Amino acid sequence: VLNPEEAELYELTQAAGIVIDQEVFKILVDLLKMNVAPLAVFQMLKSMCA
């Protein structure tokens, strides 16, 4: 699904204790790549959920 670079970061978040499916992890990483503030990513993630 996701490439060696992203595979590392996923393993990181994984051993960090959180689990999110590889597909959305890939987009998050991508949103970071386009230099979106992590807080903005978090805020919209929070809104998109319940």
Partner: protein, 102 residues
């Protein structure tokens, strides 16, 4: 422009992937994205993760593996994970949405 296209596609597939739904706010929210992490912030965030996770060494040990390689967006991604631990509701959603897709 073809930047904004990519953002919209990203917002869109998340709506798809997370079973959502006005999401034009997400576009405005994500489109304020101006450049600057601090040395404490990543330390503050990092100690908070290591408290939360079981197997904290694994996280710290591969934090170390992966900083020496200067891997891209490592620190803003670690800041994000700390922010996600705090909000236990949306942590659990992501937790569940991942069970749905197995």
């Amino acid at each position: 422009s073809m930047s904004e296209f990519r953002i919209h596609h990203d917002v869109n597939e998340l709506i798809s992937l997370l079973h959502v739904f006005g999401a034009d706010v997400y576009i405005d929210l994500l489109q304020k994205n101006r450049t600057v992490t601090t040395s404490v912030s990543t330390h503050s965030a990092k100690v908070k993760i290591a408290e939360f996770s079981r197997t904290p060494d694994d996280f710290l040990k591969k934090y170390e593996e992966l900083k020496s390689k200067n891997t891209r967006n490592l620190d803003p991604l670690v800041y994000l994970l700390s922010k996600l631990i705090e909000d236990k509701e949306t942590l659990q959603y992501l937790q569940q949405n991942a069970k749905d897709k197995a």
